[PDB]
């Protein structure tokens, strides 16, 4: 169904301002640069186990 | 000191060089006028409008109050009728109220 009026800016912001983003995990690399997410492979290959991957 | 005087249609308690606003009374600015509509003459009260405690005052300035733009209308009708009324005001102060 629908009402007989419109929804102003304030109602939307009360809906939108609580849709705001949040923070994330982080992982400083202990052997290289290219700071990466936690529990994620750094973007320069050399990972803890080994260079499980590449830089690109 | 202190004295309640009557001027225009309002009362005011006046002290040394007391500045306040009163209703306009078709009087010039700067004149030293002695009012006889005064009471509370130094903690003394008079039924016949106690006098001989003269209060000489000087008008600080005159002016026009904010515009009273009355829109006389009826609800559920437009009936817009605007007219700007102005009630003149008067700023004044006592000089030394020589008694």
């Amino acid at each position: 169904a629908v009402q007989q009026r419109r929804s102003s800016k304030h109602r939307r912001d009360k809906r939108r301002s609580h849709d705001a983003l949040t923070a994330q995990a982080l992982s400083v690399c202990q052997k290289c640069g290219k700071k990466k997410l936690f529990h994620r492979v750094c973007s320069c290959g050399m990972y803890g186990d080994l260079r499980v991957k590449k830089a690109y | 000191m202190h004295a309640i005087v009557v001027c225009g249609s309002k009362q005011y308690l006046v002290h040394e060089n007391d500045t306040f606003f009163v209703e306009k009374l078709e009087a010039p600015v700067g004149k030293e006028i002695q009012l006889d509509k005064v009471l509370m003459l130094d903690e003394k009260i008079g039924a016949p409008y106690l006098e001989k405690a003269r209060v000489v005052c000087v008008v600080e300035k005159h002016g026009l109050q904010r515009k009273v733009n009355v829109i006389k209308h009826i609800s559920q009708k437009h009936h817009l009728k605007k007219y700007g009324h102005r009630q003149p005001y008067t700023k004044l102060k006592v000089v030394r109220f020589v008694h």
Binding site: - | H78, H79, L80, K81, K82
Partner: protein
């Protein structure tokens, strides 16, 4: 007179236009009222009616 001093000689009478004004009247009212035959395009009626 002239094109900068043409003072009037007092011949100009009030003109009534029924479709103008809200604080000057002649609004929706238009000097006729709004009901019945008077609220339609029923002007210019035969005087024999």
């Amino acid at each position: 007179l002239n094109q900068l001093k043409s003072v009037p000689k007092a011949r100009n009478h009030k003109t009534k236009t029924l479709g103008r004004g809200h604080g000057s009247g002649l609004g929706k009212t238009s000097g006729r009222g709004q009901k019945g035959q008077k609220a339609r395009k029923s002007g210019l009626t035969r005087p024999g009616f």
